[PDB]
Symmetry: D2
Subunit: 294 residues, 4 copies
């Protein structure tokens, strides 16, 4: 059921606090632009620097604002199982449609550890769970064997956001976990090839600024029209690349600021772009004829 | 122009010499199974252990025996420019339809060195040239910038065999180089996603064993029917994987032996598979109900 | 900061920090000559300790140590504001230094890393040790950034390097002051790093064979690498087995066998596979360690 | 095999091997204390030399050196039959040893790696040095395979290790005999590898500063790492710049600047990017070297 165009929403900041009015407008932005679901408090949403309480407040707020018009997925994981259980329980409590649980970063648990982590959370909270695999950030990877064991034991574990350049891994997951499981692209530039292999959508960064176009790419792929998919993919390629000229979400939050959707404010260790890179970004957005407010 | 199902043909040996009887039968095998072109003396053909002379002989043998019934591409590269020019000139003289020139391995030339290497070969020999990029073996990669410059300056540098797991590189090549350039998959398990991005075919290891099925996969992709492409892809997945249980071409040549197409003979440093892996290979081939003779 | 420093494990007992075990651990190192105790590091399962447990463990280590042994507090994370607060607390309770890991997971730009450490350093007047371990953080603080940081912040005085790149060690030693201190972040690399100029090690092996490791350090610091090699190769098997599974799984299991703590981890960490635990036991018995479990 | 060994460049002139220049290079090393010369190695552009030139260069070197300095012949490739014949030729013409690289590009299995070296070693009674450089060959010979080879063939006596993994060096030193010799395959890692037990280096840097490198090796062999460190750090800038571009592009260019050979490579190798060549010149000037070009 998790499919289509999903946006990894940035978390607006103002006066060093979560900017709820901007977040609210961001939600409306996606409701009227065709986005299928919003992921709040994810990596792109700067969850590392959000307090545990801001996490629960943002999730609760998003659910209330969206109010069923679009799905709301909450980023509820970390590298501590007990903590992930509590936050996932909260998401369940406040009405979130699903929980995105990242593979534990930094402490590099064994595969048995990864199994017990996800199993513990899934058996504790009756909410759809999406595994989030991104080795380039977590410095560890959940094996397909482990994913298979997890999806088989917990009807609760239904999908995986894959931020991996290995198409072979996607093939393995699609083939082994079967049709009731859903693979979601964790990288905009790889959505087309991943969907050609059976992925059901993408949890996108580019979605933050060009919702309609990304949505179109997804529908073309879902329809099996890859001639049209390629057309959109190559048109959006420049955007996909520039959004990563610096560590995500630095570029995407900066782009949203340029479009007047939020304040140009991050929380350390994240910082504003280098003037040179920020100008490259502005120039790319202009080529797409986006209405820049700042 | 170079597209479809192309086989990276093994080079059969017998009594420590090239087995021309077996090589001839291999050519017949591909002529009546619909293969689009035969590539001889590539990595899968054990070019590393073939003398310059055997290279020359295998290429002429392939062209003459093919007798115009199937395209013949000659593997003519190495890591020394002078000899690459010489062998490529030979391929041209004996009527090869094209030359596959690998990115120099081991000596890791600079990008300028790669530019001069390929430019020299292309300008000296008027034969269509396919660049062969495989970083996992050569330990260096020809940048897209270098490829763009070469393709722009040399009319006969028309394609690239890409054995890379980076779909983004494929996107970059398709987008930056003309519609007049052809990208060929250099990895059987990656053919589907690469063609979804615009690749025109594959220089395959698997079609040595199942040419009809692989061509069917290519046909579906070219027609844009990725639903059918996926069915073939996943059907052939076990085959694609087992053929790399040990360094290519050890398993594929062993598979050809089991099918009775060649002797189970390699040239050191290559060796026969371990008894255990060989048995695992046989099990996979039986699963595909292949007519094993050995 | 120099010598044999131990990246101490954090004992657990039925869901909570085991302070009696931790207390014995402190005396264990006071009695064996260890130069300093690092609490709440990766080896101490910092990832699964709440913020309150961090500050609690840090104060407990300082107060129970009572100046008998130097205490270093692991106070970093990937959020600058939190790191400042925890580092301030370490300073507040009297820790001798603060180990601040390079932000993990969010991969800050070098400018971000600069501002991260600068902020903590300028806010808390306590000696700071940068902790670089790319294999876990998935990002690396550049030597250019370290140079700039050490040049501007007088209290940024050292770096724990868990890197297999000896060239990076050479660049740091060469570019940063003679005063700056490079501490090995990998037991297996202590000898080569010290031959290059490193001042010591923040070890994992220290948790079970404090005297032998201290011996390795002394020989290296004395310039007697003939002897350092003798100790290095003798402890080689120990060094390797301690990483048969993700650290601190092996070392805590070893401490348990030695009767130094309960066999309890916090998920996602788990007990070793029975076959790897058997391997660990065999190695320990080979060093004739008095196992109690 | 030990001490300071030079991976000699191969001078070219008008598309042919420049024997006059080569002879002078040999005298240069006899005059400056180099322990052995390796001809037709990666640094000597073996990839672009014909089998014929390989034979010619090796025979020329032995005849010129005439025992005043040891001569090691690069005789390997990724084809076993070919390596046997070239190695046989090296022994025939009087080479003191043969360096056989781990097969590149075709990625043999460990069994193939075993058979490759075993076949060469059993066919030719000449001391053999294994050359492991994963960054170029794209495969690595495991310590297990090395152990099996060294145990089986008395003439497989050493390994040139171009790896940044000190743990691999420790493993080789500990597992293989005291007789087996590990030689650094990277100038910047000679110090740490020797601190671990390596016996010398097959260097690129001593092509231009033979005396200084020799002193580094001597200090290390004597166990005086304080002195080894000052030389290591003194030569760091040189070690670094010699790899600003793929070796041997920088070192051959340096030799040309020193007037030791013509500025000529064989494609696919090319002259340095202009900006990089200028950076190289600056570094050599900093060392006050007598530049002729």
């Amino acid at each position: 059921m998790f499919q289509g165009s999903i946006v990894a929403l940035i978390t607006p900041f103002k006066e060093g606090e979560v900017d709820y009015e901007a977040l609210g407008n961001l939600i409306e932005f996606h409701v009227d632009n065709g986005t299928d679901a919003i992921l709040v408090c994810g990596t792109t949403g700067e969850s590392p620097t959000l307090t545990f309480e801001e996490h629960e407040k943002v999730i609760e707020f998003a659910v209330k604002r969206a109010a069923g018009r679009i799905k709301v997925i909450a980023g509820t994981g970390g590298n501590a199982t007990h903590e992930a259980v509590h936050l996932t329980a909260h998401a369940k409590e406040v009405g979130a449609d699903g929980a995105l649980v990242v593979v534990p970063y930094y402490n590099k648990p064994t595969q048995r550890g990864l199994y017990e982590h996800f199993k513990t959370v899934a058996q504790e909270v009756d909410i759809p769970i999406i595994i989030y695999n991104i080795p380039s950030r977590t410095c560890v990877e959940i094996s397909v064997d482990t994913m298979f064991k997890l999806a088989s034991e917990c009807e609760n574990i239904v999908a995986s956001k894959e931020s991996t350049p290995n198409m072979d891994r996607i093939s393995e997951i699609v083939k082994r976990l079967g049709e009731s499981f859903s693979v979601l692209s964790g990288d905009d530039s790889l959505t087309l090839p991943m969907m050609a292999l059976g992925a059901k959508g993408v949890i996108s960064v580019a979605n933050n600024v060009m919702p309609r176009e990304v949505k179109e790419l997804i529908r073309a792929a879902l329809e099996g029209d890859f001639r049209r998919a390629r057309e959109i993919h190559y048109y959006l390629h420049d955007l996909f690349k520039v959004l990563f000229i610096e560590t995500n979400p630095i570029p995407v939050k900066t782009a949203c600021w340029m479009l007047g959707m939020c304040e140009k404010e991050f929380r350390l260790p994240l910082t504003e772009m280098s003037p040179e890179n920020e100008n490259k970004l502005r120039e790319v957005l202009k080529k797409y004829n986006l209405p820049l407010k700042n």
